[PDB]
Amino acid sequence: DKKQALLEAATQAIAQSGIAASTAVIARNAGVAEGTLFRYFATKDELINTLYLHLKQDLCQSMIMELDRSITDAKMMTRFIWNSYISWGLNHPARHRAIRQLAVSEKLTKETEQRADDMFPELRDLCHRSVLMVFMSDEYRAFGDGLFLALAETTMDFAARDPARAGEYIALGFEAMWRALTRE
Amino acid sequence: DKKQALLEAATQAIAQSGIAASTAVIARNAGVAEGTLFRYFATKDELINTLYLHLKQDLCQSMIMELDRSITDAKMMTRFIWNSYISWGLNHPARHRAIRQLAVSEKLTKETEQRADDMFPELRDLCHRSVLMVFMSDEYRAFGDGLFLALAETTMDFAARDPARAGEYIALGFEAMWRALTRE
Numbered sequence A, B: 001d002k003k004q005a006l007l008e009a010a011t012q013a014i015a016q017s018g019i020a021a022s023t024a025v026i027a028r029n030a031g032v033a034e035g036t037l038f039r040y041f042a043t044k045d046e047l048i049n050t051l052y053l054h055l056k057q058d059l060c061q062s063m064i065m066e067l068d069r070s071i072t073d074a075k076m077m078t079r080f081i082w083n084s085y086i087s088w089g090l091n092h093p094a095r096h097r098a099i100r101q102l103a104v105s106e107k108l109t110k111e112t113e114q115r116a117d118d119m120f121p122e123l124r125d126l127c128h129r130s131v132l133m134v135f136m137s138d139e140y141r142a143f144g145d146g147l148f149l150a151l152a153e154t155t156m157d158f159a160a161r162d163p164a165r166a167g168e169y170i171a172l173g174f175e176a177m178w179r180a181l182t183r184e
């Protein structure tokens, strides 16, 4: 709860001012001393890693919940997941803002990254099925996510501004992202 | 010289804070009275449109000075422009951040979109031949540039973070942008 509050405050602080966000700020917003933040989190790096798992869990519950398992077609499954992630982001703007910054960032542990993929096994298989091999590689895995997230976050800004054409933005965003990242 | 000072200070504020950037902060960092900004630019929208054409004009000159007209394959020609844009963004981080927020904004006038299009008549004509028709359309043109600027800024962020792989990021980002935006 005091942990939960620090994770809420960390989502708000990071989305607004990115991962350079002050542990001191988070604590005051948390309604505690900085010393409490460090009791709960040994490092700012530990809190970033813990927060990313927190937000990715929150996002995958969304995605898991919406996944019609009758579907097998790779393109069809990914579109579904695209639609889940976008709608998750319209509904939680700060969560989307912090998670996109966290996902690309250098300070994620390998243990953090493994566990995230555990959270939705269906995506890891789909990416192994569909994505250009270069973006599955250790060297450019982060680059391909950063490209997915850029196109998703663009698709989101246009969607919010223009509820009227939101469906076209999502359709056009997804097909753009699919050509970008998958085998031709 | 008050105007050129302000244009530069508007660049730094809108890069940091998006178009939400306060005219109060712009004038102070510009070294002038907020009242004085308003004399040069009667409204915020006014400042936004002028700043946009200013950055667009600086970037297009760079792409024109660097363009090798001995390049005959339309794909290689665009890679060259992408290279110069990325090169420009890495040399000028605040200009690219700012030009992206401005380019994808409701606040730009049709007359601004006209003057901006004509800064490079042949880069314009190139897109007319090469880009997916939906992304040339009245409704979705802003979204196409939106998808392009997101792919380019992510490319610039990875090149800047990890200059060892700078070349492959640029190269990968171009091919992803190419499959994203263009006719097949």
Ligand SMILES: COc1cc2ncnc(Nc3ccc(F)c(Cl)c3)c2cc1O
Pocket: A056, A059, A078, A081, A082, A085, A099, A100, A103, A123, A127, A130, A131, A135, A144, A145, A148, A177, A178, A181, A182
């Ligand atoms: C087509 O390839 C991808 C599809 C994806 N779908 C959904 N999520 C992806 N990645 C992703 C990775 C990390 C994240 F935090 C978020 Cl919010 C999204 C995807 C990454 C891909 O490379």
Ligand SMILES: COc1cc2ncnc(Nc3ccc(F)c(Cl)c3)c2cc1O
Pocket: B056, B059, B081, B082, B085, B099, B100, B103, B127, B130, B131, B135, B144, B145, B148, B181, B182
């Ligand atoms: C092939 O598709 C495009 C290629 C582009 N190349 C270079 N520049 C484009 N637009 C652009 C590039 C830089 C900018 F700052 C702005 Cl505001 C717009 C392009 C837009 C496209 O849709």
